[PDB]
Design a protein around this ligand. Structure first.
Ligand SMILES: [Zn+2]
Ligand SMILES: [Zn+2]
Lengths: 684, 137, 685
């Protein structure tokens, strides 16, 4: 057990990031300086060619690979490695001008002009041909270069196209999904409503603000198609990569939504993950903002990490972050001294085998010229950003034992992108209080405050290995998923569900005749009414001797065999069941009918931590704001003690451990400065 | 002037947090007094929800007793009908969560159904009100 | 040449009147006859005619109706009035749009507009440039030698842009000229290597768009430059027959302030347009009596804009439009209180205007601006408090002919740059809502306005040498040439003040590399190494002159060389590090302010400079805050305006004995000012 599983051939933590010398070809002095600064900053891995298509192919069929040949050799000579990217992220101007079909058509059916990035038509045969060919040339030339470590396919896949080519592709997709049965499609989408019944496949179109946007089934299936065809585009990209370089691992960088650090909503990453070799993503938390504590934000980062790592049974790769500040936030505030080191260590602690940045060197002009990078316009090593990057680099060098290490969890939180889509599109409840990913984080809080390892999983992930499965607001759920949940509980698993779960099937079709028999058996109860509240509306639930504030949502509950653990205290359903528990088979099922304050989640899950013996990898006594995360090797535990507060923090090491950096045995109480991290080692 | 009878659909945001129930009730009365006065006759409530709607910012359902209250108010201001959208909740698409007499669970046990029954039971005793007007000074 | 008068027109009096639209009342002889009578009673003598009269002049193509305008000319002339004749390109007739669709605009999203509104023509269209020049020539032929003609009013409030195919190719030609047909130089200037945007043919380049390219700053900046240049080109085409047939009739076009907080108009580089005009004119509509600022604060903002537009040509300017009561297009259209109109009118004169002109003379009966303020309301009454206060202004103006042509030299200058405003606003960085570049300049303007010290708000085309003190806040974009000029300015004895987020970028929005420009580093004896952008709730403070001042929005980590540390931060990770510095360079001095501090810092900091450089008002008058004292200077005397921009009575002390301009009595000592009361005062030299 605890066997190491490696994502790449590297036996060291990758350090570096996006490199962009194709912007500096007129400046050989800068290019030479780059190599020296890479040594000084202790960076070793660099992602090259993300937006270099116009530099590789300035005219159609005219190729310039020489500058890239030199970059490969130079990086390798200083002991570095290259993550080679496919350039599909931004088409050259000559391509858009000559082949207009690569330009997107938005939902309002407006054809776009050339500009920006990440905005190609995902159906266009021309762009599929062009991207695959340039990928083939790259694979042919650099495929066996010793510096090549990894493929970085495209850049931040996202967006939709509604052109005629995509409409036809969408129609063929629908024909396959519904086995050419128009009756089945009409039944699934309930198109009898508002006389929307389709009588020919040619009538079906993608959703539009100037067309049809009132059919949930259509909206949901469209999002599914967008994901499938994006993946299709990706598969077309990697055809020569698989042929010519089967041994080189393939990834594409995932995102978080531009807001609240919730999972990217544009693409079903759970489906995407199965086509990748390793998971990678770009993190840009708004550190030092004035609407939440540093700890709250860190908790959100930990949540996303626990989601993206759990997509595979292996470490992930932080493909991008900023060493200081970004350019596109409302308030572009830079990391305070110590914060970069702290955030980097957190990334490692949650399972990253890399600390990669955007950028290496700041672009001199254009949109992201003020985005953070290792090297500022001043070209100085004197910068506090450069110095802390170097500090991270030196730390990472001493942490090669952590590479490949996993970190098993007994607690799982179930997240579903299709559920997120359906719930967001649903007409009902309250639009601004749905907050499905945020609600999951609320159930993630007590475990993060208790340093208990959590996996945030999706439905194709195995449930059997976990003692505790939490599935808040599973509004959309299939009979197959339900059956697997029933099996999970019956075999001894503990399941927690909440208000607005199992309302709808995979077609956003409402379950009829009360709630599904399985869920009713498992939970020993059933919901009969969802009460949506106004911002000033309040209620409370009395549970284990305490009344907890309720907001936004409440559920009227019909009890069968379940035990009533909590009751409402106000409104017309006062003194009726609010929290339930039910023994089912060898396991147990809990239902939380209302959205309650943080303290409820702390106390409720405290009971389960005790009942199920849920413990941290290494117990460290500390106040709130201090996070303790560990990765587990066969011979030892690597534990990160991270102070996400602006205060000194007294923590207590109950067991003797060794500082990974100094080798010093430490035990008992120690003081942590602001943003200070202690990385300790504990032999089994 | 081109219609035989006036009819309208009423969807007041009952139990909101920016005004009293009385204020909202007053506004409902104003609209009723307007649409009734378009002709010299009773009007018809063509649609209202026995519980909630689907398209409000906050879709809060009527509290116990409010539906009976609102229905009686409609009659009082000159409506010779209590008609709902919808009879039975559609299983899918845009208004699958719009209020109806029958929920997705098909139960007469529902408080929505029982109160609709209370209203209809009261309406059967009020046929004398049918056709009556209400002159104003 | 000392304090020599500079006349903008052949008028030896202050112009009073405004936009007159008799073409809306041609079916009303009674109204037109009543106009002249009320004009006399209101003491108005100058009227802008024909601004939107194209359809009245040419109802159908080739069918002209000049008779009504002939009579208006002779009628205004009869009562001793003058005519500011306007070219009608501001609103094309419906037949013109229908017959020549190429004059219609195409917006940024590439949508062709339909006919409607105003000011929305294609500024490239050869047809529209031709038609507009034709009708201008006809006007110049028929009215050029009429004695009532005073000045040309070309078009109306130039603004907006077009993205049609004609404009696209015009933009490409403009780019070829600017970059010497060197596609390499263009790509290098815009840094198009980023996101693989490198252009390989000129045909690939197009104007920015929300559905196209909007992420290339160099393109966005050069596009705005092109919009200005081609607007100017359109203007130059309009005035060809004007220069030819009427070479001695001065030409102007009315400038604007932008919709909110009275900042300079951002649609056009007025610093470039000004050079193509004989005299500067602009339209002022301050939201008087609003509930988010004091009357004094708003008046200060008005003073700033006035000082800016006046300094563009160093001669009196002309208030082309203001409302005698209220406007129609504000969120809250509140009318001026009694006294306020007289007060604001006097403030215009005090800051260099040789005219008080209104929009409009008589209210429109219908359409968009029927509830806009005017001298004559819909009731056609003279009992109106609006009409009577207009008459009060006119009565006062007739006694102020000596002020006509007079200037007001300043020792203090604040540097403003439109292209800097553009590039800074488009930049991805800092905080979008707290950039506030022109508002920041006003904050540095405040201590001098409170001390009645004359200030010129200049642009980089303006000479620097004549000033003792030049303030250049947030000069984010600056060229090598400008830096050199600032260097020489300080070296020769000038005192320069700059702030956070200056000299980051050159005229291509290209970041300077290798730390800060050596010239700036030598001048200031220091260098900025990091800009700290803050959230709304973030706070810091700077210790300076034995006192702490609050800091918001922005701070700057500073590396000291030769400079003297005069202020240090007190919080965060750069606590007890330099925040305010001073440095001697050549005969002069350079100050750097690394943080955005409260108003009281600016008061104290600039008080030091007022003492050190001996900066005094023209005539010192003792008063509390809210009283503004501004002066214009003649060879023989100073005309001093004492204005109460508060809603309470105000005690004021005149030191030197002085002559009241209206009632020629001499006054001295304490004087009591009522609410909104203005005292116009004369001090012989
Ligand atoms: Zn497409
Ligand atoms: Zn055009």
């Amino acid at each position: 057990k605890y066997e190491r599983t490696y994502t790449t051939q590297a036996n060291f933590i990758l350090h570096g990031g996006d490199y962009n010398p194709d912007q500096w070809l007129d400046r050989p002095d800068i290019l030479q300086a780059d190599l020296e600064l890479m040594k000084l900053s202790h960076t070793n891995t660099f992602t090259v060619g993300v937006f270099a298509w116009s530099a590789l192919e300035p005219e159609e069929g005219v190729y310039r690979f020489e500058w890239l040949d030199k970059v490969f050799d130079d990086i390798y000579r200083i002991g570095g490695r290259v993550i080679l990217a496919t350039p599909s992220g931004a088409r050259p101007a000559w391509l858009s001008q000559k082949y207009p079909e690569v330009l997107r058509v938005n939902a309002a059916r407006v054809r776009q002009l050339h500009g920006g990035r990440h905005n190609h038509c995902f159906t266009s045969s021309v762009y599929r041909e062009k991207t695959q060919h340039i990928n083939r040339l790259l694979a042919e030339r650099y495929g066996d270069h010793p510096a090549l470590l990894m493929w970085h396919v495209s850049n931040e896949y996202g967006g939709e196209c509604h052109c005629n080519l995509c409409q036809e592709a969408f129609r063929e997709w629908l024909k396959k999904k519904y086995n050419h049965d128009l009756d089945a499609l009409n039944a699934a989408w309930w198109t009898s409503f508002w006389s929307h019944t389709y009588t020919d496949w040619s009538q079906i179109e993608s959703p539009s603000p100037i067309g049809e946007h009132t059919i949930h089934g259509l909206n949901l299936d469209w999002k599914r198609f967008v994901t499938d065809q994006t993946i299709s585009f990706f598969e077309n990209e990697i055809v020569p990569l698989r042929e010519l370089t089967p041994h080189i691992p393939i990834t594409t960088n995932f995102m978080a939504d531009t807001h609240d650090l919730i999972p990217f909503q544009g693409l079903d990453y759970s489906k995407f993950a199965k086509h990748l070799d390793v998971i990678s993503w770009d993190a840009y938390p708004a550190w030092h903002n004035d609407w939440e504590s540093t700890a709250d934000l860190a908790m959100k980062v930990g949540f996303i990490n626990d989601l993206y790592r759990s997509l595979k049974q292996q470490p992930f790769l932080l493909m991008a972050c900023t060493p200081s500040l970004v350019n596109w936030h409302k308030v572009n505030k830079a990391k305070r001294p110590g914060m970069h080191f702290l955030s980097s260590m957190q990334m490692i602690a949650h399972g990253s085998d890399s600390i990669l940045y955007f950028q290496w060197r700041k672009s001199r002009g254009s949109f992201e010229k003020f985005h953070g990078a290792v090297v500022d316009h001043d070209n100085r090593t004197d910068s506090r950003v450069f110095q802390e990057v170097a500090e991270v680099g030196k730390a990472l060098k001493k942490m090669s034992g952590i590479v490949g290490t996993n970190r098993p969890a007994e607690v799982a939180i179930l997240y579903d992108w299709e559920n997120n889509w359906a719930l967001n599109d649903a007409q009902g409840f309250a639009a601004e209080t749905k907050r499905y990913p945020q609600t999951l984080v609320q159930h993630y809080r007590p475990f993060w405050e208790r340093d208990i390892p959590v996996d945030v999983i999706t439905k194709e992930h195995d449930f059997s290995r976990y003692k505790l499965l939490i599935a808040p607001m599973l509004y959309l759920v299939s009979e197959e998923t339900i059956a697997r949940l029933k099996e999970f509980v019956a075999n001894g698993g503990t399941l927690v569900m909440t208000y607005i779960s199992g309302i709808v099937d995979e077609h956003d079709l409402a379950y009829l005749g009360g709630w599904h028999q399985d869920l009713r058996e498992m939970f020993g109860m059933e919901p009969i009414e969802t009460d949506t509240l106004y911002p000033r509306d309040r209620n409370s639930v009395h549970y284990r001797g305490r009344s907890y504030e309720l907001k936004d949502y409440a559920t009227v509950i019909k009890i069968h065999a379940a035990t009533v653990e909590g009751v409402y205290e106000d409104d017309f359903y006062a003194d009726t069941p609010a929290v339930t528990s039910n023994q089912y088979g060898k396991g147990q099922a809990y239902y939380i009918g209302g959205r309650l304050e943080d303290q409820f989640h702390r106390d409720f899950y405290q009971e389960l931590m005790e009942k199920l013996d849920l413990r941290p990898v290494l117990f460290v006594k500390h106040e709130k704001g201090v996070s303790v995360q560990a990765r587990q090797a066969p011979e030892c535990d690597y534990v990160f003690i991270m102070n996400f507060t602006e205060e000194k923090q007294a923590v207590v090491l109950e067991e003797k451990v060794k500082d990974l950096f100094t080798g010093e045995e430490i035990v008992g109480e120690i003081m942590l400065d602001k943003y200070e991290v202690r990385v300790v080692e504990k032999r089994r």
